[PDB]
Design a protein around this ligand. Sequence first.
Ligand SMILES: CCCCNC(=O)[C@@H](NC(=O)N(C)Cc1ccc2c(c1C(=O)O)OCO2)c1ccccc1
Ligand SMILES: CCCCNC(=O)[C@@H](NC(=O)N(C)Cc1ccc2c(c1C(=O)O)OCO2)c1ccccc1
Ligand SMILES: [Cl-]
Ligand SMILES: [Cl-]
Lengths: 149, 149
Amino acid sequence: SPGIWQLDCTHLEGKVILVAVHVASGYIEAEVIPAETGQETAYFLLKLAGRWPVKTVHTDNGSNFTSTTVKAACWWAGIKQEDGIPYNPQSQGVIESMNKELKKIIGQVRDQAEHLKTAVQMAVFIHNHKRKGYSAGERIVDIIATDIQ
Amino acid sequence: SPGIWQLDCTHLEGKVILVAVHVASGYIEAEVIPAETGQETAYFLLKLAGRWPVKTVHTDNGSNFTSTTVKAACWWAGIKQEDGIPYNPQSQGVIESMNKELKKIIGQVRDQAEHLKTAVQMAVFIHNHKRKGYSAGERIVDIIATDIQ
Ligand SMILES: CCCCNC(=O)[C@@H](NC(=O)N(C)Cc1ccc2c(c1C(=O)O)OCO2)c1ccccc1
Ligand SMILES: CCCCNC(=O)[C@@H](NC(=O)N(C)Cc1ccc2c(c1C(=O)O)OCO2)c1ccccc1
Ligand SMILES: [Cl-]
Ligand SMILES: [Cl-]
């Protein structure tokens, strides 16, 4: 499970926040996009897979699962695309909670950032650095290091 | 050592490619921007520091070193800004060589990507995954994991 990620799309200020969560650690990367198109999702996954060893992605919905451009990016990057259907129901609630938590952080920084995209990146930072005692950033690095060795 | 990054700005197709290199591993993150401004650099560093434990950045030039927006991002993210002056002179040539490498990769994929930004992300992927026998992606995870424990 060191290579497993989940896509998550949430909305705020009439914009779309696209999130990738590393399932085993809770570590995230996120971007603001105008709308959640196959093309945007494909580009986001290319960026993600160049940065971390992404083996499997649970896509966030059937449109992206279907998307020719998403399928092309996954092929290019060596990613196995899977559905993101919560056969374990506690999955959906974990996501919902993260979306709520991310929006909360965004609200707390919203003041220090002129643009939504800045506040989202501040939120990524705070989320990944939060000690819970290791942080998500520490967990993902330990998980993947153990996997290499 | 595990926390040290160098900024590097290179040009192609009339656009700017902004690179951050993890000095100890050769691992990189990169983006295409229309122009290298303080605001763009500041945003790039915010994103980088939310994703990896960035302690020190050797900035690529004195305009970004001076930039009040870059200084504000570095303050926000807990980054020590340093100059990028190569007291070790083999530094310039290492950068120069990576820029040449990156541009070569971009040329090799240039055909598979409509947009420069896609080709740059493909080049980041190929760079970070190349076995050298570990890859840069493997090196950065082991360096930082060793540092955590
Ligand atoms: C309403 C509160 C406004 C107080 N903050 C500021 O005046 C400046 N913000 C910063 O110094 N930083 C660290 C954040 C930041 C960094 C880079 C960027 C940004 C932002 C951003 O704020 O969204 O936008 C695009 O490139 C600022 C800088 C540039 C443009 C606008 C604002
Ligand atoms: C010159 C030969 C072009 C052959 N490739 C294609 O037709 C498509 N490319 C892909 O399937 N992928 C994986 C790459 C990609 C992914 C996502 C994106 C992209 C690109 C990109 O190509 O730049 O642009 C922004 O969002 C394509 C898709 C959408 C727009 C344009 C092209
Ligand atoms: Cl990788
Ligand atoms: Cl981190």
